[PDB]
Each structure stands twice: as structure tokens, then as C-alpha cells.
């Protein structure tokens, strides 16, 4: 009655039967904005089904030697769905997220992945350069649907370490407990509304603390897949399409 | 009795405004003889 659970959202839902818990990012839901914090003057749009439902993006092998990754949102889904859509054709944003990481492997395999949830994560470069300077490349800020590995997981490639980042929402895939994470996250941003090209808001990491060990004879392919679904989005500022 | 023809207001108007104003929701128009967005300069 707690490792069972079923999350219906849209058309799609997941089915789950080792599970751990799931986690709202700092108590709250993710909800529409309200007429007292608004400060556009027009009318948004609320397409609620077509928009809200879970995307699966493609599947991460996880190895021995792997650093870990991570992904922007709402970056990945500005190219899938109707969601990637309304996300171009308008200028304003707002959304929720409700994300889901499934990694399985059997009663002979071992290790841990760490799927956290980081507020405004902004990639460092790695120079040692005091100004000219390296700056990270558009395709390692915004990386895509493919994501990204780390360089240097043990301080996040931010210079801040990955010992403290437990102050995120987070939950851990510990293969003898769990398969799976669940977090659901609210929208965090200074302004109301704000762009879904230029600003991304959080981003998902999923780091393997420790490694995957398996003895001889065990399969060796064990992928990692990503299943997210905005909740409660709502877009405004109709133009033409700019990606 | 004597000659009679000796016998013989503004627009603006203001108000203790606050803070700027509001804007209330609005709806879809489609219907003749009311025009609001033709003015005469």
C-alpha cells in the first residue's frame, strides 16, 4: 500500500511496484497564477490535456565508469508535442513539472543514483583564466533532449559540491530498495511569467555515487529512462514561431 | 415692472487615485453599431 502506486496525468500513466515515495518540491503543488501577482494585461491559454501529459525522452546506459548527466527544463520539450508548440508560437510561460526516472536491475546488481532537482543551475567554465575566459558552449547550457555528462560530478560542474546538494528536492535510486524517483516540482522564478527559450528554470541530474557493480553472467546493459510531464502550464503573448 | 432684461460649471472632475489601475477580463465581440476602436482625432 506504500511501494504500489499508478500516476494518471493526461492520456498516460505510469505504473509502479517497487517504489520509495514521492516528493513535492518545498511543500507546495504547482498551480495557475493569480490575479494578484499577474502583470500582463491579456488573456492566456490553457490547453490542460494536450500539454499536460508524460513525454519520455530517450534512454541514458549506465556503466562502470560513468560521471553522470543532466538536462534543462523546459528545454527538452520545446521540439515534442503540442507542448513544443505553444511554447514557440508564444511569448510567456508558466508550468509545473512532475518528473520520473525509472532504472531497474535485479537482486545481484548494486549501486545508487542521486536524482535531484536544482533551481537556476548555471554551468561554470573550467579555466583557470581571470580575464580572456572560457564560457560554456549553447549545446552544454542547453543541451537538449540528449542531455549532458558531467566533467567534474563531485562539484556539479559549478564549483559547489555534491556532498551538500541533498538541500534540493531529491530522492535516490538505491538498487537494492527502489527503481524509481519521483518529484514534483512548483514554479520557481522571481517573475510571474517569463520566456520558455531563453530561461530554463531547473534541471534534473541524475549522478551514480556509487558504482554499478555486477558479478560475471549478470546482463550489462542497464539503461536509465526519463519520463517528465508538465502540470498546470499556461502560455501567453501570441506572435509567429521562433525556436 | 422696470425693464426687464437688467434681471437677467466644468467638465473635469478628480479623484484620489492610489495605485495605477486595474483591468478587468473581457470577452468576444460580434455584433453591429458598437465601435470602440474608431475615434475621430
Same mark, same amino acid.
Given at each position: 500500500?506504500?511501494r ?18 514521492i ?5 507546495e ?8 501577482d ?5 488573456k492566456?491559454?490553457r490547453?490542460?490535456?494536450s500539454?499536460?501529459?508524460f513525454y519520455?525522452?530517450d ?5 562502470e565508469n ?15 508535442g503540442v507542448?513544443?508548440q505553444?511554447?514557440?508560437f ?6 509545473g ?7 531497474n536491475?535485479?537482486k545481484?546488481?548494486q549501486?545508487a ?7 537556476e543551475?548555471v554551468?561554470a567554465?573550467r ?13 552544454t547550457?542547453?543541451?537538449g533532449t540528449t542531455?549532458a555528462?558531467f ?12 556532498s ?12 537494492r530498495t ?10 520557481i522564478?522571481?517573475?510571474?511569467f517569463d ?16 558504482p554499478?557493480?555486477?558479478?560475471s553472467?549478470?546482463?550489462?546493459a542497464?539503461?536509465?529512462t526519463?519520463?517528465i ?5 499556461e502560455?501567453g503573448?501570441l506572435?509567429?514561431?521562433v525556436? | 415692472?422696470? +425693464? !426687464? ?6 467638465? =473635469?472632475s478628480?479623484?484620489? +487615485? !492610489?495605485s ?5 477580463? =473581457?470577452?468576444h465581440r460580434?455584433?453591429t453599431?458598437?465601435?470602440?476602436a474608431l475615434?475621430?482625432?
Amino acid at each position: 500500500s506504500d511501494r504500489v502506486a499508478q500516476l494518471t496525468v493526461g492520456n498516460s500513466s505510469i505504473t509502479t511496484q517497487e517504489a520509495a515515495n514521492i516528493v513535492l518540491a518545498y511543500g507546495e503543488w504547482p498551480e495557475y497564477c493569480p490575479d494578484t501577482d499577474a502583470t500582463a494585461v491579456d488573456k492566456p491559454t490553457r490547453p490542460d490535456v494536450s500539454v499536460n501529459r508524460f513525454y519520455t525522452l530517450d534512454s541514458k546506459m549506465w556503466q562502470e565508469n560513468s560521471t553522470g548527466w543532466y538536462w534543462k527544463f523546459p528545454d527538452v520539450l520545446n521540439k515534442t508535442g503540442v507542448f513544443g508548440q505553444n511554447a514557440q508560437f508564444h511569448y510567456l510561460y508558466r508550468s509545473g513539472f512532475c518528473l520520473h526516472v525509472q532504472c531497474n536491475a535485479s537482486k545481484f546488481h548494486q549501486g545508487a543514483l542521486l536524482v535531484a532537482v536544482i533551481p537556476e543551475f548555471v554551468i561554470a567554465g573550467r579555466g583557470s583564466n581571470t580575464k580572456e575566459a572560457p564560457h560554456p558552449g549553447f549545446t552544454t547550457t542547453f543541451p537538449g533532449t540528449t542531455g549532458a555528462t558531467f566533467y567534474d560530478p563531485y562539484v556539479l560542474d559549478s564549483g559547489v559540491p555534491l556532498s551538500q546538494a541533498l538541500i534540493y528536492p531529491h530522492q535516490w535510486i538505491n538498487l537494492r530498495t527502489n527503481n524509481c524517483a519521483t518529484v514534483i516540482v512548483p514554479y520557481i522564478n522571481a517573475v510571474p511569467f517569463d520566456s520558455a527559450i531563453n530561461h530554463s528554470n531547473f534541471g534534473l541530474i541524475v549522478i551514480p555515487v556509487s558504482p554499478l557493480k555486477y558479478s560475471s553472467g549478470a546482463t550489462t546493459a542497464i539503461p536509465i529512462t526519463i519520463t517528465i510531464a508538465p502540470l498546470n502550464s499556461e502560455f501567453g503573448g501570441l506572435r509567429q514561431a521562433v525556436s | 415692472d422696470p +425693464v !426687464e432684461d437688467i434681471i437677467h460649471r466644468a467638465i =473635469s472632475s478628480a479623484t484620489n +487615485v !492610489e495605485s495605477a489601475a486595474n483591468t478587468t477580463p =473581457s470577452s468576444h465581440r460580434l455584433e453591429t453599431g458598437r465601435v470602440p476602436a474608431l475615434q475621430a482625432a
